[PDB]
């Protein structure tokens, strides 16, 4: 369908951990990024790679793992240790297979949330539940970068959201078949699940250190669009002649908030305002099936107009409960951005303004 899993939602279920042996040289670099970046051997190892055909990656899961592998290597290659010594040309023997794979998966050739969070995890024990204690990431960048904590907590938020996402068909089927009680129950269930997702979001503090996120991890998630360090973009050697710009926005490419904006008829992509165009651009960095899901929801009849047309206080309160849970998520997200980016930075205003307008637009959708 739309590659939305009942249990893990937008996340990739049971991600592949190992590539075929043909790709051992890629996997070795990706698995040893902390040591290779620290010593300074990372870039030489990449420049020494043979060109490996992507022909031995034949299913979605091995393609997604290879994208995660190549994406981590690319971020490490471009940024190095993170102190201004950058590389402006990605060597052909990585760029060509990376771009070909990205074309097949319909994603930009840069590390994205769908790689480093949605595909970057495993269960320690397959017979135990999806808890931090029973999970790990597949790749990290530097020792002490809190990639395990940041990636896995984001993933646990996605998983919590899966419980609301799976109710969405019930919502549209109830509006269709005129089942008022069913719609009301479904909206309450969504609000309840979104409230639980907010509680899971609190775990960012349990597992992510602000200094480590801002000064280490954020470097490798950063991109080359409007970046003075790579003002023209990156040269994907042997694929495109001229450099191309792509955003590094892993920490804000989730489909979850936009999913419920569209569900609830909140028009965040409306107009030429900068917030709309930024949220529209983020979609290009989501998996195509998830972009298609978001567009399908926009094309369905409006949940908001349905609730507004019925003179039904119970329905309006269920709907408002959903909007308020989304407002609560975005408000806590603002707090997080303050603790993990702005405070460490000052020891910017466009970022917080963008986030506040998006929350404000959400808050304006309340009926009461």
Binding of ligand HEM by 251 (CB under 6 A): yes
CB of 13 to ligand HEM, least distance (A): 17
Q: Which stretch binds ligand HEM (CB under 6 A): 23-31, 44-52, 124-132, 250-258?
A: 250-258
Report yes or no: 358 and 227 within 8 Å, Cβ to Cβ: no
The secondary structure of 102-165, three-state, reads: HHHHCCCCCCCHHHHCCCCCEECCCCCCCCHHHEECCCCCCCCCCHHHHHHHHHHHHHHHHHHH
Report yes or no: 215 and 79 within 8 Å, Cβ to Cβ: no
Tokens representing 164 are: 């609301």
Q: 74 Cβ partners below 8 Å, 6+ apart? A: 90, 94, 98, 109, 110, 111
Binding of ligand HEM by 220 (CB under 6 A): no
Residue 30 phi/psi, 5° resolution? -65, -35
Q: Which stretch binds ligand HEM (CB under 6 A): 97-105, 229-237, 251-259, 304-312?
A: 251-259
Residue 55 DSSP SS3: helix
Q: x/- contact string, 317-346, with ligand HEM (CB under 6 A)? A: -------------x--x--xx--xx-----
Of 68, 80, 358, 365, the one binding ligand HEM (CB under 6 A) is 358
207 annotated as a binding-site residue: no
Q: x/- contact string, 137-176, with ligand HEM (CB under 6 A)? A: -------------x---x--xx------------------
Number of residues located near ligand HEM, criterion CB under 6 A? 21
Binding of ligand HEM by 224 (CB under 6 A): no
Binding of ligand HEM by 198 (CB under 6 A): no
Report yes or no: 330 and 358 within 8 Å, Cβ to Cβ: yes
Binding of ligand HEM by 352 (CB under 6 A): no
Report yes or no: 70 and 27 within 8 Å, Cβ to Cβ: no
Rounded CA gap, 230 and 236, in Å? 13
Q: How many helices (H) and strands (E) does the chain have?
A: 19, 4
Q: x/- contact string, 230-249, with ligand HEM (CB under 6 A)? A: -------------------x
CB of 256 to ligand HEM, least distance (A): 5
Task: Find the residue with minimal CB distance to ligand HEM.
Answer: 252
Rounded CA gap, 74 and 220, in Å? 9
Q: Please identify, using beta-carbon distances, which residue of 97 and 248 lies nearer to ligand HEM.
A: 248
Q: 230 Cβ partners below 8 Å, 6+ apart? A: 78, 86, 88, 224, 243
Q: Which stretch binds ligand HEM (CB under 6 A): 20-28, 65-73, 222-230, 254-262?
A: 254-262
Of 74, 102, 254, 328, the one binding ligand HEM (CB under 6 A) is 254
Binding of ligand HEM by 219 (CB under 6 A): no
Q: From the annotation, which residues make up the binding site for heme b? A: 333
Binding-site ranges for ligand HEM (CB under 6 A): 150, 154, 157-158, 204, 208, 213, 249, 251-252, 254, 256-257, 330, 333, 336-337, 340-341, 351, 358
């Amino acid at each position: 369908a739309y590659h939305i899993d009942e249990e893990v939602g937008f996340a990739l279920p049971n991600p592949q951990e190992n590539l075929p042996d043909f790709y051992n040289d890629w996997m070795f670099i990706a698995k040893h990024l902390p040591d290779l970046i620290e010593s300074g051997q990372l870039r030489e190892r990449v420049e020494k790679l043979n060109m490996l055909s992507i022909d031995h990656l034949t299913d979605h899961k091995s393609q997604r793992l290879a994208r995660l592998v190549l994406g981590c290597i690319t971020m490490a290659y471009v940024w190095g240790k993170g102190h201004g010594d950058v590389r402006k040309v990605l060597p052909r023997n990585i760029a060509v297979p990376y771009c070909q794979l990205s074309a097949a998966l319909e994603l930009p050739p840069i590390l994205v949330y769908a790689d480093c969070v949605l595909a970057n995890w495993k269960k320690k024990d397959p017979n135990k539940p999806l808890t931090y204690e029973n999970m790990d990431v597949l790749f990290s960048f530097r020792d002490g970068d809190c990639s395990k904590g940041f990636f896995l907590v984001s993933l646990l938020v996605e998983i919590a959201a899966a419980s609301a996402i799976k109710v969405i068909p019930t919502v549209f089927k109830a509006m269709q078949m005129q089942e008022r009680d069913t719609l009301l129950k479904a909206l309450l269930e969504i609000a309840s699940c979104l409230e639980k997702a907010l509680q899971v979001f609190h775990q960012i503090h349990d597992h992510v250190n602000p200094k480590a996120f801002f000064s280490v991890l954020r470097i490798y998630l950063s991109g080359w669009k409007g970046n003075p360090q790579l003002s023209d973009g990156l040269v994907y050697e042997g694929f495109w002649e001229d450099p191309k710009e792509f955003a590094g926005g892993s920490a804000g490419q989730s489909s979850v908030f936009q999913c419920f904006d569209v569900l609830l008829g909140i028009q965040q992509t409306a107009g030429g305002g900068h917030a709309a165009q930024f949220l529209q651009d983020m979609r290009r960095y989501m998996p195509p099936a998830h972009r298609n899901f978001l567009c399908s929801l926009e094309s369905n009849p409006s949940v908001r107009e349905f609730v507004l047309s019925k003179g039904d206080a119970g329905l309006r309160e269920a709907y408002d409960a959903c909007v308020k849970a989304l407002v609560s998520l975005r408000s806590y997200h603002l707090q997080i951005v303050t603790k993990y980016i702005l405070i460490p930075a000052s020891q910017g205003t466009d970022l917080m303004n963008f986030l506040k307008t998006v929350r404000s637009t959400t808050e304006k959708s309340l009926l009461k």
